Amino acid sequence: INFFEIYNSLPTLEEKKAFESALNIFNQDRQKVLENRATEAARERWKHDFEEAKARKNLNVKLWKWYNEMLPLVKEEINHCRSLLSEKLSDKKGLNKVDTNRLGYGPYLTLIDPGKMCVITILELLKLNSTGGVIEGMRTARAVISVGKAIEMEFRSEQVLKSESQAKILWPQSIRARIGSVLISMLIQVAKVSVQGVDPVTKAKVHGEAPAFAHGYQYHNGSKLGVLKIHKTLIRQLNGERLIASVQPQLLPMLVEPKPWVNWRSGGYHYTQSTLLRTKDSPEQVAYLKAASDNGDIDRVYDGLNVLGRTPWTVNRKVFDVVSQVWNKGEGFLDIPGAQDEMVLPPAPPKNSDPSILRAWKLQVKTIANKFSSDRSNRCDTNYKLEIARAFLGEKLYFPHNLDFRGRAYPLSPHFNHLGNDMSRGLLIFWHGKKLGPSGLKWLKIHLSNLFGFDKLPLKDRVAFTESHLQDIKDSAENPLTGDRWWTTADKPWQALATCFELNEVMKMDNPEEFISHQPVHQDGTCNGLQHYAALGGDVEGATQVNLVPSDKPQDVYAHVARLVQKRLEIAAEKGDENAKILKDKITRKVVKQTVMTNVYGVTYVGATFQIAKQLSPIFDDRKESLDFSKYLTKHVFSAIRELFHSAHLIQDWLGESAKRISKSIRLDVDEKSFKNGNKPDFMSSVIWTTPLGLPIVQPYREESKKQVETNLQTVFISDPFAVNPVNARRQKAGLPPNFIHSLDASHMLLSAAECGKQGLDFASVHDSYWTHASDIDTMNVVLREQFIKLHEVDLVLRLKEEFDQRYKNYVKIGKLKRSTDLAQKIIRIRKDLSRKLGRSTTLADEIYFEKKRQELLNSPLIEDRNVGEKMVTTVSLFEDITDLDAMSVLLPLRLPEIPPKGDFDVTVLRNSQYFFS
Template sequence: MFFKWALLCLFCRQNPVKRYGVIVCDPVIHSGLDRSVNHMMVPYVPMLVPPKKWKGYDKGGYLFLPSYLMRTHGSRQQQDAIKCAPVKQMQKVYEALDTLGNTKWRVNRRILNVVETVWGGGGNIAGLVNRNDVHIPELHSDAAEEIKKWKWNMRKAKKINRERHSQRCDIELKLSVAHKMKDEDGFYYPHNLDFRGRAYPMHPHLNHLSSDLCRGLLEFAEGRPLGKSGVYWLKIHLANLYGGVVKKLSYDQRLAFVENHLNEVLDSADNPLNGNRWWLKAEDPFQCLAACMNLSEALKSSSPHTVISHLPIHQDGSCNGLQHYAALGKDSMEAAAVNLIAGDKPADVYSEIAARVHDIIRLDSEKDPTIDPNATIAKLLVDQVDRKLVKQTVMTSVYGVTYVGAREQIKRRLQEKGLITDDRLLFSAACYGAKVTMAALGELFQAARGIMVWLGDCAKVIASENQPVRWTTPLGLPVVQPYFKSQRHIIKTSLQVLALQREGDSVEARKQRTAFPPNFVHSLDSTHMMMTAIACRDSGLQFAGVHDSFWTHACDVDKMNQILREKFVELYSMPILENLLENFHTSYPTLTFPALPKRGNFDLREVLKSPYFFN
């Protein structure tokens, strides 16, 4: 027998003997594992040579380690769909993943030195967790009320310490990879997909999809001269990383912000830890510091345009999920709200919704509380409505956030403000705030809501026949929603009953319906990113993609901006919803689907002229 049963007894005050059955390794096998365990731990680290080109489900990526095109998490139908897809159909998907995998990175040593100093000093700044645990309170009284308070404080302290321990381990993992790679000329990240087509590096720790720490530590291995436009985009990038209201300003105002803080930029670059530490006030401090260092080098040069830059410059979509819905619905008002139409400054959909929410709540607050019970809650909330209160709910609305989810999001924001301390009152305020926010969203994005409902209705029809929703993205990737009820296999032993689970044959109808609209939009944003990646490769640009954030060298931002707009127009010039409906009729010939929703007449070519579409 390779394994044997063991009996574990735990003693506690409430239950003196609690037995658990566990499986342990036989000593003979255990001794063999000691010699071979290093081969069992699959080290998906960055590669020092370019990854293998993708040519099939398990053909590509790492040279010798198991590599799979898609993270299917055991979904048999999704695996079969990918394996059976013709190579010609999948060619563009393979090319996009190869493009992302061929981008060469290196460690930014100056940032690494700063991080090591901060971490060695105990952390607790620039988003790094405190390396010290919080004090565990002691009990100083036998009074029942004091014991109750002590227990609550002790549980809270232990929870904080567990979270800090987890965060410290995560940072140590990231730094260990950075140390191993810091002397390398460059390295690569093989990429694969989730089932919706979104691309991710296969190495999980130090990669550009991760935190500000990781992004600050990474830069392109290939450097390119800043050129005529590079200094301009480097300053815009710095303003974007500083964040807050600065990112919502016009380009001219962002440039003015940086120009007004050049002394702080130079000080941050020269004395990051012993100077004024302006960079620590940024939303993304380590990335901001990296930009300060690069800009400082250019400003001190007699020829700024010739300075070599390794820094990736980001261009981010404006509430990208709603941008895709606006393109599908072709509604001019919705398109303007998410920057598909040119404006003097970026349209801010979060501020627009916040203003609408404030107007509704203000009107409710003026009503008679004896007639409208919402009036009392409205008076409490009317001065607390701001962009931050509604942002998360607006952002997740296109990804299927429910009323309960919106309520919890707004509740957390109200807790942060700290003006409502009574729990029952806080809950009532969150309920009312969620209802008003979702009503305001429905008013502004009626076409998007109509498409969302249509997608959900189609999924409901499919799931009612115990079928998963399946479709093919415009780039040829077959997608099957992996939401099936689990089958339980019971194994009875003398110690306990084990229940093993695997994917069953029955679909989770509700999950198939609610998840389809956000999954479909994710498959479209991944398509746009992959189309842009291939076009940037063909134009000689370095490219990295983080879903709706596209990166390239400062000197190439203008070209990338042109490409990503052209590809967005190309994508939505296709009859996407018509093709989807035809796909459904082909895949489910016996089912009847609702008619396509009405759409507007917005001219998609307006996107080509919109400076803040991605910015």
């Protein structure tokens, strides 16, 4: 039964609320069944389909054949392990499996049911297709690790269910791999598939049986890569009509209210526990998050996440019908690539041709293969989404959120959510419906104008556009297919279709103010990354250029750069240039958007070339391998914007210099005793700061400590999560300028979400884009401006500088100075002092160790004890007399640069600007 049909039919909010409460009490059981006994449902579907096919969907028939044939081997494998564990000790055993290997992974196999293990391994292999960059398969290490992690998750769900029904802590990756290797090594020999071949000599067609999966190796730039490959028959099976129940996600959206976030390790799903941060690679992030959660410094983060999570959604109906009709057509559409069977490759050049020609042909073939596979992947993903929305039609679904290590919120359900592409954004609406009122109609018109790409004009122009095109709106909404299909011309078609639906229903009425509209209306920040620099350095020109100060018409930075580049090319194309004539009119704000965006984040020349090259292909100004225009365009873009953002570049360079200085600092405690590896020590200090909302941000960039661990298939090259390694001084200097700004944006989003949730709105955010009902846009805008003013009223660059200074007090850098410079000369005298008392020449480690105890002496609570220690003058203590530190090797204090001067800009003046968010 489709409960959404009943919900809209009720007359008054009282009956609706009673029905919703009863529905939640009912849906608790459905959610509990869904989370715990989902794989048994897949087994039941496999068995049913097999029985039906035998009595009188081909993929489901085969899967039960493998699972029923794999199961005997697993029961034999576990029995062998238990035999060795039954006997206490056996000194002499064959090194093959019984000596150590079956003792290594013995206990971990005995945990869960063998049939469950078979189901998990089949599902995990079938999900990992065309991942890691293998053409028709996957990487072996990722496959075995994923299988092991899935087995562990199933064990902990079963364990918690047993513990809460009757009334190591985490597996090492040297143990997770072996379980997956054993299961996959059984499945490789179990699986079979039927293939049709053509004889090369006699040209006689034959049939045969071949293993479904195989294991091989491949090489990229002089390095092997173990891969698992899938027969083409399975691949072409995986692009059929639909896949009803064979591969169902284990982390699909909830049916009831999510568990509120009350701690850093408790929230989200009922039977499943999820950590606040997505980055589980580093342990230091976990340590700092636990420390900050114990006190309770991040209550605002909890509030924002709770407000985001508890928004009820529901699957759109009419758009689902339209998509179902388009999918059944079997032909390529707006973005659905269509079912292509065989791909096309140009004829190979004669082998006598110059090697450059053959290399170019190989590059072209590589490009063609990536497109064909990228298209197949898109089609399969669209089919999977249409599967997920099918079973959830007319159902209430909630999206819990978590964070990455900076603060940006991401839904837990990876496949079907509102962060997906345009089609996924089209199949979702709000369950709670609001009357349009005097403003909802205008805001819905503005939303349609936004979705049609015309969101750079004033508001009156957008309303005029929609009022003019009302006829096409009705024409496209009545019959989406076999009509004029005006909604296909839109920049975002699968949302403009729903907007046209709602506008048509509205205009078929006589009173717009009585309609209940469920369509979310976006409000995206314009040049958000530059808005944060404008508010940080207090630049008036920068604030004007990013729609901060009140104005009359929208201003943007990317269109300005596009016009500059266009006139540059036009001048160039008028003096006889050949490439500029082609690119004379092909430059728009979309082509030059991400290069202007990421210039202030530190984008490289080659990264910019690939950005612009990726952006050229959708308009096919050239072909896929015509990347030589992109180099010219990026050179012109950099030349044009060489002298545009100066206030922003100052903060970018300050953050870069600060990160470089921190990454080369040594604390006195870590250098407790020389490692004797070398005179130079290791650097283990990362860059850490705190969000304005209290959250700690630790950059997890450290050198890799990978090693090869043997499995049944191969020896996989994996890392040690517990290892602490010297920091990556290249990525610490490159990640700070983007990470700081993204954390600022995330904090602003969390503040705004919390306030809007308290005020009663339905809220949902996508980075800089915030959604709400068509009738709540004015209140939401007021909240946005108020929270931005609250965030940026206090100086943040200076606060960051003070926090760094108070976090890295007793940290020492290493540098060089002239042996005859008087400042450096005096240390040599101190270097001579240890020759008698210590008995040996003074060294770097000893000089550092000397100051370690003096800090304890300085902080001794006794005043008499302070005089004992404070009188000493160490090598570091020489520099305390002066401050001009810029102008052998000597230790130096960790001094951070001066903050860029702050301009005279008032942040409150934006509270009346109506183009800040639009």
